[PDB]
Design a protein around this ligand. Structure first.
Ligand SMILES: *[C@@H]1O[C@H](CO)[C@@H](O[C@@H]2O[C@H](CO)[C@@H](O[C@@H]3O[C@H](CO[C@H]4O[C@H](CO)[C@@H](O)[C@H](O)[C@@H]4O)[C@@H](O)[C@H](O[C@H]4O[C@H](CO)[C@@H](O)[C@H](O)[C@@H]4O)[C@@H]3O)[C@H](O)[C@H]2NC(C)=O)[C@H](O)[C@H]1NC(C)=O
Ligand SMILES: *[C@@H]1O[C@H](CO)[C@@H](O[C@@H]2O[C@H](CO)[C@@H](O[C@@H]3O[C@H](CO)[C@@H](O)[C@H](O)[C@@H]3O)[C@H](O)[C@H]2NC(C)=O)[C@H](O)[C@H]1NC(C)=O
Ligand SMILES: *[C@@H]1O[C@H](CO)[C@@H](O[C@@H]2O[C@H](CO)[C@@H](O)[C@H](O)[C@H]2NC(C)=O)[C@H](O)[C@H]1NC(C)=O
Ligand SMILES: *[C@@H]1O[C@H](CO)[C@@H](O[C@@H]2O[C@H](CO)[C@@H](O)[C@H](O)[C@H]2NC(C)=O)[C@H](O)[C@H]1NC(C)=O
Ligand SMILES: *[C@@H]1O[C@H](CO)[C@@H](O)[C@H](O)[C@H]1NC(C)=O
Ligand SMILES: *[C@@H]1O[C@H](CO)[C@@H](O)[C@H](O)[C@H]1NC(C)=O
Ligand SMILES: *[C@@H]1O[C@H](CO)[C@@H](O)[C@H](O)[C@H]1NC(C)=O
Lengths: 195, 596
């Protein structure tokens, strides 16, 4: 056992970006040991859908994808198949047959300052819904009135991206939370990622 | 698309911006209130200026959307709130004059000082010494001097300011669609757009008058008994059939009659219900008191405090260089941050105040899910009634025995119950005629029925008529007695207390009946029942979304205020008062004037 699949980079990264632009990491060609995940602080929500947590080491797949982003405390329940709500249907949409586990732990001490945090943005308006596993970065004036916005803000012309705000004195449910999502899948190719 | 969606998007943006701005402003205000420094004053000023400005531009932008195209009946409410509370229609000079008048009135009331009689050596302030003198001093001459000097020196300056102020407020109200400032004030209770629950701004006056007509006899019997006791106290001055002198009511203005308990105790020989010695013996402290209150709140099934409340709330006097205002308050900074500010001592008064403030905190927590413009009580009385019902329930001997402070060997009977009822009455019943008179006079003066040259004559005429209190010294139109009150000087509505008095007793009767209670109403405990708490929470979670008439129906099965719960509560004292008033004529005489 030499090539350990390294998860302490997707975790333990000191930077998780914004939810509206979430990073994606492809893990392959290594030996995967999931015991290293349980070495961190107590997890707020450890939910596995398609695989038993005890048997993660007894089955293996072709490739594994890891996604990381930061959201509010009370929108964690929305990162799940079949859920409906702003964050789920505008920033990160999951499919119905999703197979994997959802990881979320609090980071209030690390992602908050008394002055205020404005480096964690999220989308508020969009013309249409999002297909599963889709990403959007376009920043244009969301026109709501009949008269064209002409690329300027004002009456019935609003910016789509709006930023969070994080202070140490916020109550539970508004404090920042760090979320990591693991995905497993199949295709006509050797698996080669387990051990 | 449609006006409804175009307004929904705007409301969605405003909801997110307002929360952040309000949180910043509230944090600055809390920092100043816990830390009195010039830098904190500047921070509060900056935060308030930013919040007021932002509200102004948001209200200005909200005028684009007409109301007649909306049928959600909720977006309409939010837009109406924004417009009403952010619109200004006055010119710049008139607005500056109005703000200057308000600031001058507040400064004069705050810094007003009276000096010792016929002496320029020393001058005293209202709160430190005048309140104590009015509460405790039995000197007729001293009380009369303090009353006359204070009222003259506060009203003679503020009378023309009040005239200009009422002129400006009437102009502003007439610029708006309301008839006058009285109608503007009364518009709070108006409910429109719903069938079977509509309310009119003019119905409030009729309802208040009907309730007062029903409540008069208890007040007149209590007045007769208090007159007899005050005659026993001061022999010479009081007249058998005349009104009581104003300066002998135990306070500055006559709002409360609590200070007369020592003179008017029915059965003094019986021991009084006091647990301060018990708390001292058991070595209680503020944290223990608050934990006991939280346990009582949990016992009914409501959720309890988070860790942030305990971590941030201050419950002790800082002392040393750190000085803070010690008036108990319940703070709702928003965004899940709830704090309580209070300088606490080991007394039963503070023990009850803990429950009183915790009730407001729970009510604030209840409607956290509602939108920003709806995170408020149904009207101006619901919040106070919810705060007061818990204090009403927490004073029972059953609760005191269950906690363990009261000795189990304590027994209750005739005289304990009557003393407790009279002590409660002297605080609750006495203020109602005063509040009704003050609100009626303010409504009349705002309407314009009472001319300026007859303001004082009408004031003292209804003083002789309704409350049955006669002035000790004659006054001309130079004085301004009503302006001597804090609420009158600082432009606050005054019918909220009158509404709360009935609302609290209706809620208490409903909860006691839900808890399957039996026996007299004044011995009722709801600590262990889990159905009354469920009903109360069901009402609390609504917020401003539903009409207050609908909420009141959901609670008590009624669509209007009533006084029958109060009469049922005070009937045991009423029978004893009827028994004791056998040889005393009931009723005051208006023709009597103490100054010959
Ligand atoms: C729309 O804009 C209006 C401004 O025109 C805002 O209206 C204000 O609303 C607040 C919230 O209700 C009102 O605040 C209340 O003020 C009362 C006045 O008390 C004065 O006197 C006491 C001393 O007796 C002082 O300590 C205090 O600071 C005041 O100077 C308070 O008594 C009220 O407190 C009550 O509740 C608390 C619990 O929260 C209890 O602990 C208290 O004992 C008391 O029962 C309350 O704080 C304010 O008066 C309103 N302004 C005016 C001019 O009437 C709206 O908020 C705004 N709406 C928005 C932004 O949505
Ligand atoms: C007036 O407008 C409001 C605002 O849209 C309407 O309230 C909305 O009602 C719908 C349906 O009850 C709610 O949808 C629900 O959303 C949750 C997630 O938030 C989802 O889990 C549920 O399954 C359901 O789809 C919607 O949230 C709610 N909006 C708000 C802001 O509360 C209301 O219905 C309108 N009234 C009329 C008479 O049209
Ligand atoms: C009470 O207020 C004083 C003055 O506002 C605070 O002293 C300030 O403390 C901050 C940070 O602690 C410093 O940056 C300032 O320079 C200090 N100012 C002065 C004039 O000393 C004090 O810390 C406050 N007390 C509490 C408990 O917050
Ligand atoms: C609510 O229930 C609690 C616990 O079941 C009661 O608390 C007891 O009260 C009796 C007095 O009746 C005391 O002798 C016990 O020591 C108490 N036990 C505890 C654990 O507190 C409480 O009395 C009940 N409330 C009412 C109003 O009866
Ligand atoms: C990441 O891990 C390293 C060492 O394992 C540690 O020094 C660092 O503090 C960690 N940072 C975070 C944000 O967990
Ligand atoms: C009340 O607080 C205590 C801790 O002080 C906690 O154990 C209890 O669960 C809380 N009540 C409820 C209903 O959660
Ligand atoms: C006191 O209680 C006794 C009980 O028998 C009753 O006879 C008496 O009339 C009561 N007195 C008053 C003033 O209620």
């Amino acid at each position: 056992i030499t090539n350990l699949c390294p998860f302490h980079e997707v975790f333990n990264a000191t930077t998780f970006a914004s939810v509206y632009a979430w990073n994606r990491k492809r893990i392959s060609n290594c030996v995967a040991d999931y015991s290293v995940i349980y070495n961190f602080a107590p997890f707020f929500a450890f939910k596995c859908y398609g695989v038993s947590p005890t048997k993660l080491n007894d089955l293996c797949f072709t490739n594994v994808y890891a996604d990381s982003f930061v959201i509010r405390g009370n929108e964690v329940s929305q990162i799940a198949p079949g859920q409906t709500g702003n964050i789920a249907d505008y920033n990160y949409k999951l499919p119905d047959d999703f197979t994997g586990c959802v990881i979320a732990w609090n980071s209030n001490k690390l992602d908050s300052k008394p002055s205020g945090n404005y480096n964690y943005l999220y989308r508020l308006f969009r013309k249409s819904k999002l297909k599963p596993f889709e990403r959007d970065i376009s920043t244009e004036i969301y026109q709501a009135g009949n008269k064209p916005c002409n690329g300027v803000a004002g009456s019935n012309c609003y910016s789509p991206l709006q930023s969070y705000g994080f202070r140490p004195t916020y109550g539970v449910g508004h404090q920042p939370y760090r979320v990591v999502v693991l995905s497993f899948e199949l295709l006509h190719a050797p698996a080669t990622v387990c051990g | 698309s449609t006006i409804e969606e175009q307004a929904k998007t705007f409301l969605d943006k405003f909801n997110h911006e307002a929360e952040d701005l309000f949180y910043q402003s509230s944090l600055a205000s809390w920092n100043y209130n816990t830390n009195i420094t010039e830098e904190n004053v500047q921070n509060m000023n900056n935060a308030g200026d930013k919040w007021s400005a932002f509200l102004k531009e948001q209200s200005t932008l909200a005028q684009m959307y007409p109301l007649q195209e909306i049928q959600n009946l909720t977006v309409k409410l939010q837009l109406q709130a924004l417009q009403q509370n952010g619109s200004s229609v006055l010119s710049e000079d008139k607005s500056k004059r109005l703000n200057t008048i308000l600031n001058t009135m507040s400064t004069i009331y705050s810094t007003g000082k009276v000096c010792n009689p016929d002496n320029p050596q020393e001058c005293l302030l209202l709160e430190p010494g005048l309140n104590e003198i009015m509460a405790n001093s039995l000197d007729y001459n001293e009380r009369l001097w303090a009353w006359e000097s204070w009222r003259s020196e506060v009203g003679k300056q503020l009378r023309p300011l009040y005239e200009e102020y009422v002129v400006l407020k009437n102009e502003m109200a007439r610029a708006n669609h309301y008839e006058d400032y009285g109608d503007y004030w009364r518009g709070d209770y108006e409910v429109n757009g719903v069938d079977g629950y509509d309310y009119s701004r003019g119905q409030l006056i009729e309802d208040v008058e009907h309730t007062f007509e029903e409540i008069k006899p208890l007040y007149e019997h209590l007045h007769a008994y208090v007159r007899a006791k005050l005659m026993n106290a001061y022999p010479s001055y009081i007249s058998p059939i005349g009104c009581l002198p104003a300066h002998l009511l135990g306070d500055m203005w006559g709002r409360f009659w609590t200070n007369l308990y020592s003179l008017t105790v029915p059965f003094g020989q019986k021991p009084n219900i006091d647990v301060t010695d018990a708390m001292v013996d058991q070595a209680w402290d503020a944290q223990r008191i608050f934990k006991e209150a939280e346990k009582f709140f949990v016992s009914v099934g409501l959720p309890n405090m988070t860790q942030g409340f305990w971590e941030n709330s201050m419950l002790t006097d800082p002392g040393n260089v750190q000085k803070a205002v010690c008036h108990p308050t319940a703070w709702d900074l928003g965004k899940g941050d709830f704090r309580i500010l209070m300088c606490t001592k080991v007394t039963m008064d503070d023990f009850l105040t803990a429950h009183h403030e915790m009730g407001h905190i729970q009510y604030d927590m209840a409607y956290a899910a509602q939108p920003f413009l709806l995170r408020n009580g149904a009207n101006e009385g619901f919040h106070e009634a919810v705060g007061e019902i818990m204090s009403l329930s927490a004073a029972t001997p059953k609760h005191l025995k269950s906690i363990g402070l009261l000795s189990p060997d304590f027994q209750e009977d005739n005289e304990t119950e009557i003393n407790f009822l009279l002590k409660q009455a002297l605080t609750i019943v006495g203020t109602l005629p005063f509040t009704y008179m003050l609100e009626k006079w303010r409504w009349m003066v705002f309407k314009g029925e009472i001319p300026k040259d007859q303001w004082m004559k009408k004031w003292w005429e209804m003083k002789r008529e309704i409350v049955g209190v006669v002035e000790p010294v004659p006054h001309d139109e130079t004085y301004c007695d009503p302006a001597s009150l804090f609420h009158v000087s600082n432009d606050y509505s005054f019918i909220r207390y009158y509404t709360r008095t009935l609302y609290q007793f209706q809620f208490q009767e409903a909860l006691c009946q839900a808890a399957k209670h039996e026996g007299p109403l004044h011995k009722c405990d709801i600590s262990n029942s889990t159905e009354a708490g469920q009903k109360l929470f069901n009402m609390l979670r609504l917020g401003k979304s539903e009409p207050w008439t609908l909420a009141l129906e959901n609670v008590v099965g009624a669509k209007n205020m009533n006084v029958r719960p109060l009469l049922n509560y005070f009937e045991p004292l009423f029978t004893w008062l009827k028994d004791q008033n056998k040889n005393s004529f009931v009723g005051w005489s208006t023709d009597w004037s103490p100054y010959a």
